[PDB]
Design an enzyme around this catalytic site. Structure first.
Site, PDB file in Angstrom:
ATOM      1  N   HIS A 149      28.580  35.496  42.119  1.00  0.00           N
ATOM      2  CA  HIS A 149      29.182  36.277  41.049  1.00  0.00           C
ATOM      3  C   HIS A 149      28.635  35.944  39.667  1.00  0.00           C
ATOM      4  O   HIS A 149      28.278  34.793  39.402  1.00  0.00           O
ATOM      5  CB  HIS A 149      30.689  36.066  41.048  1.00  0.00           C
ATOM      6  N   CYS A 204      28.723  42.941  38.305  1.00  0.00           N
ATOM      7  CA  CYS A 204      29.059  41.801  37.464  1.00  0.00           C
ATOM      8  C   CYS A 204      27.826  41.417  36.633  1.00  0.00           C
ATOM      9  O   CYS A 204      27.913  41.115  35.442  1.00  0.00           O
ATOM     10  CB  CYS A 204      29.628  40.639  38.299  1.00  0.00           C
ATOM     11  N   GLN A 218      34.886  45.964  36.194  1.00  0.00           N
ATOM     12  CA  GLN A 218      33.824  46.615  36.960  1.00  0.00           C
ATOM     13  C   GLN A 218      34.383  47.468  38.096  1.00  0.00           C
ATOM     14  O   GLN A 218      33.722  48.392  38.583  1.00  0.00           O
ATOM     15  CB  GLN A 218      32.875  45.561  37.528  1.00  0.00           C
ATOM     16  N   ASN A 263      35.738  36.907  32.668  1.00  0.00           N
ATOM     17  CA  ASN A 263      35.367  37.640  33.863  1.00  0.00           C
ATOM     18  C   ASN A 263      35.310  39.123  33.551  1.00  0.00           C
ATOM     19  O   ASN A 263      35.500  39.532  32.405  1.00  0.00           O
ATOM     20  CB  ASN A 263      36.367  37.366  34.974  1.00  0.00           C
TER      21      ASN A 263
END
Lengths: 241, 111
Positions: free
Chosen positions: A174, A42, A36, A204
């Site tokens: 997150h 996110c 990102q 992630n």
């Protein structure tokens, strides 16, 4: 908007499973990890990652969707200034699918006006369901990767490898993806007997240099009810068929 | 309510200090003035989590009766007459990517 108990039923039925380990990374369920960069999106990477995963699992197709379109066009969220996962899915339904990131490239914080008719065909979902904070393993096993929230700290952003159990964040902040759970035997240096250490596998969106090639392992128990950092207090998964 | 949105973060946040420190030091270096500046107070700082950490500072800066660190850095004192002290406000935007041991100064516009 659906009911877990009714859905898990048709996808699980009997098929009993092993709570020790299952990793979609070895079952064509996880697409490449992205980044990102400088922009708080996110929530989008998490969402979209979940749908790409659903296509690879149910349609056998490997597509990569555009989180840019989602960032520009999701008037429920706030583009690079945060958002919620369920709002993301919500808008996917309204927008009627998202374009492949091949026609709608990511540009993070760079000024960019939203434009839907920017690709030949879009990929969307039929709806999405929420997962009970005590069903993640079950969910993962028969439904697939889950888009989750989690509280991250500095000790987290510094993760390098192994099954992490450092300090958590202050509050959920997150958005990530849950792509499975593993289990490692580790001889306790004092009792000299190997102990079983269970953990969850998370994807992630900070690139491949971070953590174990973009992923991170989180400590948990055999039933997976132990959700470090509240990981999963927010758990959603898109349905496309 | 939201994932990934800019959050408050307290003034004594060590991670912030380091962020500010860098910002200011970078400044004095970009500035051409023979006198080094330095912060009077932190007005409003926010930290956003992203592919690394991002900080947003609102601070009041001032000119001190000191050289460009060739000194220490280290606390002089501000110029006694407010016109040499040329007080003002700046907004810094630092972006650190620790797992790449790097740090930047995305935006630094003063009033």
């Amino acid at each position: 908007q659906m009911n877990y108990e009714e859905v898990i039923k048709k996808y699980r039925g009997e098929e009993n499973f092993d709570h020790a380990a299952y990793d979609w990374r070895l079952h064509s369920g996880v697409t490449p990890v992205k980044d990102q960069k400088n922009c708080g999106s996110c929530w989008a990477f998490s969402s979209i990652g979940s749908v790409e995963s659903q296509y690879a699992i149910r349609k056998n197709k490997l597509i990569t969707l555009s989180e840019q379109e989602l960032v520009d066009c999701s008037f429920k969220n706030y583009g690079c200034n945060g958002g919620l996962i369920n709002n993301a899915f919500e808008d996917m339904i309204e927008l009627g699918g998202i374009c492949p990131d091949g026609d709608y490239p990511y540009v993070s914080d760079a000024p960019n006006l939203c434009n839907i008719d920017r690709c030949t065909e879009k990929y969307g979902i039929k709806n999405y369901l929420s997962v009970p904070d005590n069903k993640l393993k079950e969910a993962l096993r028969f439904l697939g990767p889950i888009s989750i929230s989690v509280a991250v700290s500095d000790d987290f952003a510094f993760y390098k490898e192994g099954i992490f159990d450092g300090e958590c964040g202050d509050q959920l902040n997150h958005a990530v993806m849950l792509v499975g759970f593993g289990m490692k035997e580790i001889v306790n240096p004092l009792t000299k007997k190997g102990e079983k250490h269970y953990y969850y596998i998370i994807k992630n969106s900070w690139g491949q240099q971070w953590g174990e090639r973009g992923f991170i392992n989180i400590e948990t128990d055999e039933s997976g009810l132990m959700r470090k950092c509240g990981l999963g207090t927010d758990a959603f998964i898109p349905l496309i068929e | 309510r939201l994932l990934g949105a800019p959050v408050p973060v307290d003034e004594n946040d060590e991670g912030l200090q380091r962020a500010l420190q860098f910002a200011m030091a970078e400044y004095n270096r970009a500035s051409n003035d023979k006198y080094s500046s330095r912060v009077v107070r932190v007005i409003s700082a926010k930290r956003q989590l992203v592919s690394g950490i991002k900080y947003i500072l609102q601070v009041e800066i001032g000119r001190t009766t000191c050289p460009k660190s060739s000194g220490d850095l280290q606390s002089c004192e501000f110029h006694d007459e407010p016109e040499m002290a040329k007080y003002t406000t700046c907004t810094f935007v630092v972006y650190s990517i620790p797992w790449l041991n790097q740090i930047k100064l995305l935006e630094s516009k003063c009033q």
